[PDB]
């Protein structure tokens, strides 16, 4: 009974309905591919390890963990049916953040700040 | 458990 992590996020569902739309084109190519560049990026580039991390109760309080690594694959694998889906997984991956710490964390300040340039980038998407 | 000493 030491700590485990569960399995990640589905990335792939042959019987998922899907799309490949401007929108989600953009959400990889502009959104993502430039968020996943910044210096606060780190920590969310794939699922919390919550046994590398020490964070033995992380999963106790978070049931729908979400990551850019996760987000990346499904765009990738034109997992997603529309735009809308994949921002939700944005969202889920921030109130995560919040949720688990407290303000004023390094690790909420980090999140704050991915989230202010995700807005900023899907405020205007393709048609 | 936490990610960073409190701040």
Known sequence: ?127 | ATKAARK
């Open chain 1, 1 to 127: 009974m030491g700590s485990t992590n569960p399995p990640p996020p589905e990335t792939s569902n042959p019987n998922k309905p899907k799309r490949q739309t401007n929108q989600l084109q953009y959400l990889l190519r502009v959104v993502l591919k430039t968020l996943w560049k910044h210096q606060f990026a780190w920590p969310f580039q794939q699922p919390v390890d919550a046994v590398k991390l020490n964070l033995p109760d992380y999963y106790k309080i978070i049931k729908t963990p979400m990551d850019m690594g996760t987000i990346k694959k499904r765009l990738e694998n034109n997992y997603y049916w529309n735009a809308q889906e994949c921002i939700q997984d944005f969202n889920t991956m921030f109130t995560n953040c919040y949720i688990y710490n407290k303000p004023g964390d390094d690790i909420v300040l980090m999140a704050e700040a991915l989230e202010k340039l995700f807005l900023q980038k899907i405020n205007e998407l393709p048609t």
